[PDB]
Design a protein around this ligand. Structure first.
Ligand SMILES: [Mg+2]
Ligand SMILES: [Mn+2]
Length: 272
Protein backbone atom coordinates (compact mmCIF):
# COMPACT_ATOMS: atom_id res chain seq x y z
CA UNK A 1 0.00 0.00 0.00
CA UNK A 2 1.01 3.62 -0.71
CA UNK A 3 0.05 6.50 1.62
CA UNK A 4 0.06 9.78 -0.35
CA UNK A 5 0.50 13.08 1.54
CA UNK A 6 0.53 16.39 -0.35
CA UNK A 7 1.68 19.77 0.92
CA UNK A 8 -0.34 22.73 -0.34
CA UNK A 9 0.68 25.30 2.26
CA UNK A 10 3.45 27.77 1.60
CA UNK A 11 6.75 26.71 3.16
CA UNK A 12 9.09 29.60 2.27
CA UNK A 13 8.31 29.28 -1.50
CA UNK A 14 10.30 31.72 -3.63
CA UNK A 15 9.04 30.20 -6.90
CA UNK A 16 5.58 30.88 -8.29
CA UNK A 17 4.33 27.44 -9.33
CA UNK A 18 5.68 24.85 -6.88
CA UNK A 19 2.40 24.50 -4.98
CA UNK A 20 0.71 23.97 -8.37
CA UNK A 21 3.43 21.55 -9.44
CA UNK A 22 2.89 19.49 -6.30
CA UNK A 23 -0.86 19.37 -6.92
CA UNK A 24 -0.35 18.22 -10.52
CA UNK A 25 2.14 15.52 -9.47
CA UNK A 26 -0.22 14.26 -6.77
CA UNK A 27 -3.12 14.10 -9.21
CA UNK A 28 -1.07 12.00 -11.66
CA UNK A 29 -0.14 9.57 -8.87
CA UNK A 30 -3.75 9.37 -7.68
CA UNK A 31 -4.96 8.54 -11.20
CA UNK A 32 -2.17 6.04 -11.89
CA UNK A 33 -2.26 4.17 -8.57
CA UNK A 34 -5.93 4.57 -7.57
CA UNK A 35 -5.02 6.61 -4.47
CA UNK A 36 -6.54 9.58 -2.68
CA UNK A 37 -4.04 12.02 -1.25
CA UNK A 38 -4.11 13.61 2.16
CA UNK A 39 -3.77 17.33 1.34
CA UNK A 40 -2.29 19.63 4.00
CA UNK A 41 -2.11 23.42 4.17
CA UNK A 42 -3.55 26.46 2.39
CA UNK A 43 -1.81 28.14 -0.59
CA UNK A 44 -0.20 31.57 -0.17
CA UNK A 45 1.81 33.66 -2.66
CA UNK A 46 5.54 33.30 -3.07
CA UNK A 47 7.86 35.86 -1.48
CA UNK A 48 11.57 36.54 -0.99
CA UNK A 49 11.33 36.58 2.79
CA UNK A 50 14.09 35.67 5.23
CA UNK A 51 14.00 32.16 6.73
CA UNK A 52 13.36 33.74 10.13
CA UNK A 53 10.05 35.09 8.79
CA UNK A 54 9.05 32.24 6.46
CA UNK A 55 9.64 29.45 9.01
CA UNK A 56 7.07 30.71 11.59
CA UNK A 57 4.60 31.45 8.80
CA UNK A 58 4.83 27.77 7.77
CA UNK A 59 4.39 26.38 11.30
CA UNK A 60 0.80 25.21 10.92
CA UNK A 61 1.51 23.46 7.61
CA UNK A 62 4.72 21.88 8.94
CA UNK A 63 3.06 20.54 12.09
CA UNK A 64 0.22 19.08 10.02
CA UNK A 65 2.66 17.37 7.63
CA UNK A 66 4.60 16.01 10.61
CA UNK A 67 1.49 14.46 12.11
CA UNK A 68 0.40 12.89 8.80
CA UNK A 69 3.88 11.55 8.08
CA UNK A 70 4.11 10.14 11.61
CA UNK A 71 0.91 8.14 11.12
CA UNK A 72 2.05 6.81 7.75
CA UNK A 73 5.57 5.93 8.93
CA UNK A 74 4.30 4.04 11.98
CA UNK A 75 2.16 1.80 9.74
CA UNK A 76 3.44 -0.57 7.10
CA UNK A 77 2.90 1.30 3.84
CA UNK A 78 5.26 3.22 1.58
CA UNK A 79 5.07 6.86 2.71
CA UNK A 80 5.02 9.18 -0.32
CA UNK A 81 5.12 12.93 0.21
CA UNK A 82 4.55 15.27 -2.73
CA UNK A 83 5.90 18.57 -1.43
CA UNK A 84 5.91 22.08 -2.83
CA UNK A 85 9.40 22.82 -1.42
CA UNK A 86 12.31 20.94 0.08
CA UNK A 87 11.62 22.89 3.29
CA UNK A 88 8.68 20.60 4.07
CA UNK A 89 11.31 18.02 4.91
CA UNK A 90 12.31 20.04 7.99
CA UNK A 91 9.21 18.40 9.46
CA UNK A 92 9.48 14.96 7.90
CA UNK A 93 13.16 14.06 8.23
CA UNK A 94 13.18 14.18 12.07
CA UNK A 95 10.21 11.79 12.06
CA UNK A 96 12.10 9.41 9.75
CA UNK A 97 15.23 9.62 11.92
CA UNK A 98 13.15 9.07 15.06
CA UNK A 99 11.29 6.03 13.72
CA UNK A 100 14.20 4.53 11.73
CA UNK A 101 17.43 5.58 13.45
CA UNK A 102 19.41 3.32 11.11
CA UNK A 103 17.91 4.76 7.92
CA UNK A 104 20.09 6.36 5.25
CA UNK A 105 18.62 9.46 3.63
CA UNK A 106 19.42 9.87 -0.06
CA UNK A 107 19.00 13.61 -0.56
CA UNK A 108 18.92 13.96 -4.36
CA UNK A 109 19.35 17.61 -5.22
CA UNK A 110 21.36 19.88 -7.50
CA UNK A 111 22.23 21.76 -4.28
CA UNK A 112 23.54 20.72 -0.90
CA UNK A 113 20.73 22.44 1.09
CA UNK A 114 23.22 22.49 3.96
CA UNK A 115 23.39 26.19 4.91
CA UNK A 116 22.93 27.50 8.45
CA UNK A 117 21.65 30.93 9.55
CA UNK A 118 25.33 31.93 9.74
CA UNK A 119 26.36 30.69 6.28
CA UNK A 120 23.33 31.40 4.08
CA UNK A 121 23.97 34.06 1.43
CA UNK A 122 20.29 34.32 0.40
CA UNK A 123 18.36 33.64 3.63
CA UNK A 124 16.32 30.99 1.81
CA UNK A 125 14.91 28.31 4.13
CA UNK A 126 15.02 25.80 1.26
CA UNK A 127 18.81 25.98 1.27
CA UNK A 128 18.90 25.06 5.01
CA UNK A 129 16.92 21.78 4.99
CA UNK A 130 19.46 18.96 5.34
CA UNK A 131 21.55 20.94 7.84
CA UNK A 132 18.43 21.56 9.95
CA UNK A 133 17.47 17.88 9.99
CA UNK A 134 21.05 17.00 10.98
CA UNK A 135 21.02 19.51 13.85
CA UNK A 136 23.56 22.09 12.63
CA UNK A 137 20.87 24.67 13.42
CA UNK A 138 17.49 24.54 15.18
CA UNK A 139 14.44 24.66 12.89
CA UNK A 140 12.02 24.18 15.76
CA UNK A 141 10.93 20.85 14.26
CA UNK A 142 13.58 18.57 15.71
CA UNK A 143 16.67 17.04 14.20
CA UNK A 144 18.25 13.68 14.98
CA UNK A 145 19.42 12.69 11.49
CA UNK A 146 23.04 11.59 11.77
CA UNK A 147 25.12 13.34 9.08
CA UNK A 148 26.92 10.01 8.64
CA UNK A 149 23.56 8.66 7.43
CA UNK A 150 22.87 11.46 4.91
CA UNK A 151 24.08 11.15 1.30
CA UNK A 152 23.84 14.03 -1.15
CA UNK A 153 23.22 12.63 -4.63
CA UNK A 154 23.68 14.71 -7.75
CA UNK A 155 24.81 17.89 -5.99
CA UNK A 156 27.35 20.00 -7.86
CA UNK A 157 28.96 23.43 -7.97
CA UNK A 158 28.63 23.82 -4.20
CA UNK A 159 29.86 27.02 -2.55
CA UNK A 160 33.23 26.47 -0.89
CA UNK A 161 31.90 27.56 2.51
CA UNK A 162 28.89 25.25 2.37
CA UNK A 163 31.02 22.41 0.98
CA UNK A 164 33.20 22.80 4.08
CA UNK A 165 30.26 22.36 6.46
CA UNK A 166 29.24 19.27 4.46
CA UNK A 167 32.65 17.63 4.75
CA UNK A 168 33.10 18.63 8.41
CA UNK A 169 29.75 17.08 9.31
CA UNK A 170 30.57 13.86 7.43
CA UNK A 171 27.87 14.13 4.76
CA UNK A 172 28.93 12.21 1.64
CA UNK A 173 28.41 13.71 -1.81
CA UNK A 174 27.91 11.67 -4.99
CA UNK A 175 27.99 14.09 -7.99
CA UNK A 176 25.91 13.34 -11.12
CA UNK A 177 28.68 11.64 -13.09
CA UNK A 178 29.30 9.25 -10.19
CA UNK A 179 25.61 8.71 -9.29
CA UNK A 180 25.06 5.28 -10.79
CA UNK A 181 22.59 2.89 -9.19
CA UNK A 182 25.46 0.80 -7.84
CA UNK A 183 27.23 3.83 -6.38
CA UNK A 184 24.06 4.80 -4.54
CA UNK A 185 23.44 1.19 -3.44
CA UNK A 186 26.98 0.91 -2.07
CA UNK A 187 26.46 4.11 -0.10
CA UNK A 188 23.37 2.83 1.72
CA UNK A 189 25.01 -0.52 2.62
CA UNK A 190 22.52 -2.57 4.73
CA UNK A 191 20.26 0.29 5.86
CA UNK A 192 16.62 1.05 5.14
CA UNK A 193 16.34 4.04 2.85
CA UNK A 194 14.42 7.32 2.60
CA UNK A 195 14.61 9.12 -0.76
CA UNK A 196 14.18 12.89 -1.00
CA UNK A 197 14.23 14.40 -4.54
CA UNK A 198 14.48 18.06 -5.57
CA UNK A 199 13.82 18.18 -9.31
CA UNK A 200 16.54 20.79 -9.88
CA UNK A 201 18.93 17.82 -9.76
CA UNK A 202 17.88 17.04 -13.36
CA UNK A 203 19.77 18.14 -16.44
CA UNK A 204 17.69 20.90 -18.13
CA UNK A 205 15.33 18.87 -20.23
CA UNK A 206 15.99 19.47 -23.90
CA UNK A 207 17.10 15.83 -24.02
CA UNK A 208 18.04 16.41 -27.67
CA UNK A 209 21.52 15.96 -26.18
CA UNK A 210 23.07 12.75 -27.51
CA UNK A 211 26.47 14.40 -28.10
CA UNK A 212 26.68 16.51 -24.90
CA UNK A 213 27.87 15.26 -21.53
CA UNK A 214 25.22 16.31 -19.00
CA UNK A 215 25.95 18.45 -15.98
CA UNK A 216 22.85 17.30 -14.09
CA UNK A 217 21.41 13.86 -13.54
CA UNK A 218 19.39 12.26 -16.33
CA UNK A 219 15.91 10.83 -15.67
CA UNK A 220 17.30 7.39 -16.50
CA UNK A 221 19.74 7.71 -13.60
CA UNK A 222 16.91 8.58 -11.18
CA UNK A 223 14.83 5.66 -12.44
CA UNK A 224 17.83 3.34 -12.06
CA UNK A 225 18.11 4.33 -8.38
CA UNK A 226 14.43 3.54 -7.78
CA UNK A 227 14.89 0.21 -9.61
CA UNK A 228 17.89 -0.68 -7.39
CA UNK A 229 16.53 -0.03 -3.88
CA UNK A 230 14.81 -3.25 -2.71
CA UNK A 231 11.12 -2.70 -1.97
CA UNK A 232 11.45 -4.14 1.53
CA UNK A 233 14.11 -1.55 2.40
CA UNK A 234 12.35 1.57 1.06
CA UNK A 235 10.73 3.58 3.86
CA UNK A 236 9.36 6.46 1.85
CA UNK A 237 9.86 8.97 -0.94
CA UNK A 238 9.56 12.76 -1.10
CA UNK A 239 9.08 14.54 -4.43
CA UNK A 240 9.72 18.29 -4.23
CA UNK A 241 10.12 21.49 -6.26
CA UNK A 242 8.33 21.03 -9.59
CA UNK A 243 7.90 24.63 -10.76
CA UNK A 244 5.17 24.22 -13.40
CA UNK A 245 1.90 26.17 -13.73
CA UNK A 246 -1.39 24.41 -13.23
CA UNK A 247 -3.09 23.51 -16.54
CA UNK A 248 0.13 24.12 -18.48
CA UNK A 249 1.35 21.73 -21.15
CA UNK A 250 4.70 22.01 -19.37
CA UNK A 251 3.27 20.46 -16.20
CA UNK A 252 1.68 17.57 -18.11
CA UNK A 253 5.02 16.85 -19.79
CA UNK A 254 6.95 17.09 -16.52
CA UNK A 255 4.65 14.80 -14.54
CA UNK A 256 4.85 12.12 -17.26
CA UNK A 257 8.63 12.08 -16.88
CA UNK A 258 8.23 11.95 -13.09
CA UNK A 259 5.88 8.96 -13.29
CA UNK A 260 8.44 7.13 -15.43
CA UNK A 261 11.21 7.73 -12.90
CA UNK A 262 9.32 6.65 -9.77
CA UNK A 263 7.40 3.75 -11.33
CA UNK A 264 9.82 0.94 -10.24
CA UNK A 265 9.51 1.78 -6.54
CA UNK A 266 5.84 2.77 -6.58
CA UNK A 267 4.75 -0.25 -8.64
CA UNK A 268 6.52 -2.58 -6.21
CA UNK A 269 4.89 -0.96 -3.17
CA UNK A 270 1.44 -1.10 -4.77
CA UNK A 271 2.02 -4.83 -5.41
CA UNK A 272 2.71 -5.71 -1.74
MG1 LIG B 1 17.99 22.11 -5.32
MN1 LIG C 1 16.42 21.42 -2.47
Amino acid sequence: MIDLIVSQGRVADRAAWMIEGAARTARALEERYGLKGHYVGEPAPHADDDWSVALPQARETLVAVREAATESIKGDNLTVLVNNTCSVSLATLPVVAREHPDAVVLYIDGHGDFNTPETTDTGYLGGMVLSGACGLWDSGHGAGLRPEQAVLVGSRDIDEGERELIRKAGVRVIPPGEATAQAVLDAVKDAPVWIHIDWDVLEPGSIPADYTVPDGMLPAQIRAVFEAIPAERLIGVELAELNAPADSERAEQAVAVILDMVAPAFDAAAAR
